[PDB]
Amino acid sequence: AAKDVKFGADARALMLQGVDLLADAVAVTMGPKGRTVIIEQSWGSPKVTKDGVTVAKSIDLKDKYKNIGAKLIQDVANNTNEEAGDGTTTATVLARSIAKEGFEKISKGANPVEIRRGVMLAVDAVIAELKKQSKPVTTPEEIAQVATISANGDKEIGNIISDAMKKVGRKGVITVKDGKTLNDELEIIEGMKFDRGYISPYFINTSKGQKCEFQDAYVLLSEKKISSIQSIVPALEIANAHRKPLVIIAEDVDGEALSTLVLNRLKVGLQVVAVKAPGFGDNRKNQLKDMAIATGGAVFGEEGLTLNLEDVQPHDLGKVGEVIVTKDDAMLLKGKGDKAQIEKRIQEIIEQLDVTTSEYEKEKLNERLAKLSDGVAVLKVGGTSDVEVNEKKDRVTDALNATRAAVEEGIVLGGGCALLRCIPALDSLTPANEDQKIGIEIIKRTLKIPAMTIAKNAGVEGSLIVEKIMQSSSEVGYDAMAGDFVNMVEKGIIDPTKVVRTALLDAAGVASLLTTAEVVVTEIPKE
Amino acid sequence: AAKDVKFGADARALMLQGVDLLADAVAVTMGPKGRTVIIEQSWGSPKVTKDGVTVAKSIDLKDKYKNIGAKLIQDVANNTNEEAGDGTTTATVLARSIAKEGFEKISKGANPVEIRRGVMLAVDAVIAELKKQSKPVTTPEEIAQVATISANGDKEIGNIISDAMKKVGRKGVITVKDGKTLNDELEIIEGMKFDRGYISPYFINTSKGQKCEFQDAYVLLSEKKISSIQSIVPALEIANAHRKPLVIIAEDVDGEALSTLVLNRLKVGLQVVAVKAPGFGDNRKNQLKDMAIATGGAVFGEEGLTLNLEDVQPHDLGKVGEVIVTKDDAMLLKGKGDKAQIEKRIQEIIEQLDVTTSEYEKEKLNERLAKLSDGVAVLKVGGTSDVEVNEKKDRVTDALNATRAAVEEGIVLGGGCALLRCIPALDSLTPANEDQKIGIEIIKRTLKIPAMTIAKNAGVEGSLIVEKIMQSSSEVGYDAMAGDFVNMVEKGIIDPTKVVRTALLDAAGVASLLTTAEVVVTEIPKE
Amino acid sequence: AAKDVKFGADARALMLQGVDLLADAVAVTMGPKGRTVIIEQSWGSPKVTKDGVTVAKSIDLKDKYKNIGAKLIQDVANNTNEEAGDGTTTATVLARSIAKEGFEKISKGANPVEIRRGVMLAVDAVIAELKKQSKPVTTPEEIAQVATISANGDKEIGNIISDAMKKVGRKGVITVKDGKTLNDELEIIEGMKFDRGYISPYFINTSKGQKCEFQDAYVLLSEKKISSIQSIVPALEIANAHRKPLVIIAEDVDGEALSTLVLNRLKVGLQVVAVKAPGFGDNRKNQLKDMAIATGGAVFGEEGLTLNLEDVQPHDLGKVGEVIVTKDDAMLLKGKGDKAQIEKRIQEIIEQLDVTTSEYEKEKLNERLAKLSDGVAVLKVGGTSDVEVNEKKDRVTDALNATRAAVEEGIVLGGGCALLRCIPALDSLTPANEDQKIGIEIIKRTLKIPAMTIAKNAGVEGSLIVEKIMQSSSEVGYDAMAGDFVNMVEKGIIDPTKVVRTALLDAAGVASLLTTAEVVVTEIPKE
Ligand SMILES: Nc1ncnc2c1ncn2[C@@H]1O[C@H](COP(=O)(O)OP(=O)(O)OP(=O)(O)O)[C@@H](O)[C@H]1O
Ligand SMILES: Nc1ncnc2c1ncn2[C@@H]1O[C@H](COP(=O)(O)OP(=O)(O)OP(=O)(O)O)[C@@H](O)[C@H]1O
Ligand SMILES: Nc1ncnc2c1ncn2[C@@H]1O[C@H](COP(=O)(O)OP(=O)(O)OP(=O)(O)O)[C@@H](O)[C@H]1O
Ligand SMILES: [K+]
Ligand SMILES: [K+]
Ligand SMILES: [K+]
Ligand SMILES: [Mg+2]
Ligand SMILES: [Mg+2]
Numbered sequence A, B, C: 001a002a003k004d005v006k007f008g009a010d011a012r013a014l015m016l017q018g019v020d021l022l023a024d025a026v027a028v029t030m031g032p033k034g035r036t037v038i039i040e041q042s043w044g045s046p047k048v049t050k051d052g053v054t055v056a057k058s059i060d061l062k063d064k065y066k067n068i069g070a071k072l073i074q075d076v077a078n079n080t081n082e083e084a085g086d087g088t089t090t091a092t093v094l095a096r097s098i099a100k101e102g103f104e105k106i107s108k109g110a111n112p113v114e115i116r117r118g119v120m121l122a123v124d125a126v127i128a129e130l131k132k133q134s135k136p137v138t139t140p141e142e143i144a145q146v147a148t149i150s151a152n153g154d155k156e157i158g159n160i161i162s163d164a165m166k167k168v169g170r171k172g173v174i175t176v177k178d179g180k181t182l183n184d185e186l187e188i189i190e191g192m193k194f195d196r197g198y199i200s201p202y203f204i205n206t207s208k209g210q211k212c213e214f215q216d217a218y219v220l221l222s223e224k225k226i227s228s229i230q231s232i233v234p235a236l237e238i239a240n241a242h243r244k245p246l247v248i249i250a251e252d253v254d255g256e257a258l259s260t261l262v263l264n265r266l267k268v269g270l271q272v273v274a275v276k277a278p279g280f281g282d283n284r285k286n287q288l289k290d291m292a293i294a295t296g297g298a299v300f301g302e303e304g305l306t307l308n309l310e311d312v313q314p315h316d317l318g319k320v321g322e323v324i325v326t327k328d329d330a331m332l333l334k335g336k337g338d339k340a341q342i343e344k345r346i347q348e349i350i351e352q353l354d355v356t357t358s359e360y361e362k363e364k365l366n367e368r369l370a371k372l373s374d375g376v377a378v379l380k381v382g383g384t385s386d387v388e389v390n391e392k393k394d395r396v397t398d399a400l401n402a403t404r405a406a407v408e409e410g411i412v413l414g415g416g417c418a419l420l421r422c423i424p425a426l427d428s429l430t431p432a433n434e435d436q437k438i439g440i441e442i443i444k445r446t447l448k449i450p451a452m453t454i455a456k457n458a459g460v461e462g463s464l465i466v467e468k469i470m471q472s473s474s475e476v477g478y479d480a481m482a483g484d485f486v487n488m489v490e491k492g493i494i495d496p497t498k499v500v501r502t503a504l505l506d507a508a509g510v511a512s513l514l515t516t517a518e519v520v521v522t523e524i525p526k527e
């Protein structure tokens, strides 16, 4: 395939045009007074979004040279989103600033690689200053404030996130889902709920709600399928001798045993119910073992130390205070396992979490830990249509990510003032040569961009706002929603440190390497 | 397919246009003050590179006559890269110089073949002079300096390469890999690590880290799969009699033996663990034998002198001071084999290396030698994004190749001064006729190109720099980064001899044959 | 498919245009001062060639009428290459001369068929004169001179070819192969080497080089596969009784016999090795029989007079002074067969060569004869890249073909003087009518073309050179490389007679028939 080659200023200008287009599209969404972007979808209704990475990923250019800069800015935004989950618009604007200022300074005598070295040095100094300015989060009010700021000033979302974190802990499992009503809802799931229904309608004993409900029930855990009458009769005899209900959690129940169970339930009133084992693969075994420790029972059919159903004993069965089974899910609430064994299992899970990490494995381990310790939380997002619901879920996810980041690390001032307060740290550096000085100056000029963008979206002159902020005391910043100068921490305009440093590092890392190019090679368009 | 034919000057001009385009694209990247090239990729983000062969391979031209010269220059760069692994930009610029000067001298009375003969004679003389000027490498400081120069002035890369060579030897196994952090890392792997995990989680005996760890363990090596209980029981009896752990490295472990192992481990505390054999094919047998000599044991199930598991004896088992097995890899650290047998095995491996050579076979033999003698080194390259990591891995690989070349042979001056100092050797030649004189003069003029290119990329007049260098003493050269005239060896601006001679030889060999053409035949473009 | 028809002068002019284009392209490569042609390849790097037939085969024209002449000239060149393997450029230029002069003489009253008859008569007379002027080759110096002239003045190629012919004979087997070094190499393979390696690594007994080496070994030749232990044990018993090594050359060795062999070799030190039979099909049987006569043994498993392995006797085994077996090839060096039987086998092979001839059969018979009599020679061609190596192999192959032709027949003067010295023979002919006189004059004018072309490529006026040559004594010719008038035979500027007569005959035969056309029919181009 034939190719086209460009040198120097023309190539730099075309790439800067692409970068400027993508960054201009992204920048309109930043701050409390930003606006939304509508993106055409090929299979239905368009998206309406206020999210930087979503807007960035949706733009592809016809010209081959502009698309290079567009793709690099997309890489910046995607890396920021993957690492922190928030702060992608800030990263995009910082990257454009660095790229433009770098391109403006290239000449015959310049050495772009040394300029890149100076840029990296300055960014390291800035990150050190940011880490020195951070403070830890200690109160639920700070959690609510962070969530409110991340959700674009919505107090209800912050309140619901704070309540969820209070109920399931600051490191618990919280998920976001679509709602079917006009309003948002918070649902707390306690105990062990594994989403498996009763095998046969004949086991129902509660008319209102169509539920099978038992109290003080024996639990029979079977790793392998139950088929024969010989393997099932002893458990029924044990249960009937003591006059207690029995819940059989097993891989499956076959025709003969199921027929015996239904016949006894119908003609004797025997209190029994059967359910499938949850999870597939080794996860099924892990869940069954977790239930075994939780209820104080044993697992039958294990490959190691195989325990036979034929000689089941009364002490091999778990005990649960309440069992609720319905068509879609089942729940055992109050097990009777030994606390020490449960704590040992929790310790084993949290140690396994630290050994090898993957999204699937981490998700499963966290779910197991939550089911065994504290429970899970579900936030249901409401709205009148799919477009509104998706738009609001974007903000809810941003708020959750920001709150987790602010729990892992501290908080700094919001509104772009945190980066403004790091400018004095760059005045202490002594560059080795002229190119590193150029890089340091590039970073020093770039550090003002976020506050100016926020002020510009608000309809005021950003440069005057930044000048007045820099002339005030360290605790004072600009409230763009109210349009005033206030004490940022007292008003709750705060940001996570991790998001800020991640955005700065990614933007600098990509833009400084972009500004070192001299030749660009592209493919000639096909017919 | 119809074809087009061109004669003489027009064809030469078109081919020279193609050569000039490709060489101009490549030349911008040369020296401490060179710049990068951005190459569009059809499946994602573009590449940013400062590597000559990568840039050369990426250019294809629409015109059929320019593409011929482009392909020839690509051949030059690819041959230089395959032979030395470094110095491709120098080869490209030398090839362009030779081609242009050769085309300028063709006339009615000229004989291009004799000009080629003279060019080859001059190149042979120059290589002889280079070999006379070389000096061996003796100190780690020279290794660090060579690595630093090859990595574009990065001192950390040179230091890490020097440390790796000190730890595993100047001819050990060093590999380059992607990192997941901001900084580069050096990892030394000792003993015998073959990347096979424990078969069953039941064998774990260490909670923190999820590891199976033993001290003073017996090792049972099985070439063939272990299935039956009779073949496995005797080894367990031998191990239990002496109260020692047992690690079974075998092709595989089947249901019955695995059940026995897990049952005994769980209900008795028997200290056992089992793992797969590493490598596939004859490599598996070779690895098993290597472990056998290393630990002083024997291999069961060999086709020749078959040794049966049923009559295993205490002296047929290896002994290892430490065994560490986890989900992904296993390691035996301190074997108890006889030193003489290990030395004999090493000698056999190094003799096999000299008989027949292939990339796969050489890689496997080197890995076996390293595992048995000294260990391996891994350099993990860090960065904020994939583009930066790839760009830096390019330089790390260049530095490794240059250091290996400089260990095989000596070193000469850098900055292009080595070829400048060979010009006086061409003044001693007596050509047989006029055409060979023309070729000698072509080479004499070409010998100045690298230094001029390095000076030009630095923003100064290259001809004056070369003139001042040639008027100075033999030890003085031009430092382009500082912009001074210095003692090259004291500053550490040095090059490998092999890279220089390889680049010169390849460039001359291809360009001199290019400059002998009179007719060019191409295919007419299709619709 | 519709067709276009042209008559007379227009068609002749278009065909002559095509002929002239192809011949002009080919002619630039002729003589010591010819130049090369670059041909585009669709799958990689272009070819650089100085070979007439390669250039001719690469040209196809868009116009349907020019392509006819181009294809006819291609036929001339291909026939010359297939018959003699050299002299294709001379044939091309002669064909163009004949075609142009024939077209110039066609008029209303002319009879082209009689002109063709006269051309053939003149060519027959010229060939008779050439055969009268030839002299046989007697000394190795003449061989070296012929090879040097054919290789475009390269003395090293001529020397290496002469050395190879001295070592393996003037009619031995010599092959040309790619080298992996900068310089050419000559390798002589003696004895019987059939390129089959040892079956099992266990048979190796020499560490340095990984070889299995034996002296004074028995040879067991088996036509059919060896599977059972009964068929193999008797040979081992016979070998062990006399304390001698044993090499088993067989179709294959199966599991049981191979296990016995490896076990005995490992636990007893029994000196044995086994190898596959070389060649496939009846060639395998022929090779096995050849080895049988060579070593004085017998072949087991033949369909006729089947001889059983179970009753093998000591006198049925061959004896070889030295056996060398490695991973890739095996060699038996000094057999002990009866000389009379070997001579009878050689006589049978050389008689079979004369009965039926094909390239495959002739190649196999020659290889068998060489392995049994004198050995083979391999010339490895060196270079820095594939293009140079291919370009040089072209010349090496030309030199080999020319030397073989000059050994079959005599030699004449080079530089085109041989055809110049045949002009006086055409002055003795008496034509029957005017058309035959026209043909004789056409040939007489054509006989000067090669010398004029050689002089023209050298940058001088060819007509004056030819005039001065024709005015000198018979032994004087023009040295174009030096640019002088010399004694051709003393300087070594000589040609094979066969090449000259073949080129003349083919060129005349095709061109004279081309010049008889009046109507041309072609197909109308498609869309
Ligand atoms: N009322 C406010 N006054 C001043 N600054 C504010 C106010 N509310 C939010 N900010 C600041 O605005 C920025 C938040 O902008 P926004 O959430 O749109 O962009 P982002 O986090 O960079 O990207 P993303 O689209 O991924 O959320 C943060 O600097 C926050 O401190
Ligand atoms: N500070 C310096 N001063 C002078 N010359 C230098 C300096 N640093 C490196 N050089 C010289 O620059 C050349 C290295 O250039 P570079 O590595 O870009 O090209 P290359 O090795 O020919 O190709 P490749 O792209 O394969 O690495 C060598 O001649 C080295 O001696
Ligand atoms: N030094 C020389 N002086 C004069 N004539 C020479 C000299 N060297 C070679 N020749 C003549 O040049 C001709 C060889 O040309 P060349 O080998 O290029 O063409 P060809 O044999 O017709 O074709 P091909 O391309 O197949 O080899 C022969 O006539 C040879 O006698
Ligand atoms: K936004
Ligand atoms: K470079
Ligand atoms: K030729
Ligand atoms: Mg946000
Ligand atoms: Mg380099």
Ligand SMILES: [Mg+2]
Binding pocket: C086, C087, C150, C398
């Ligand atoms: Mg020839």
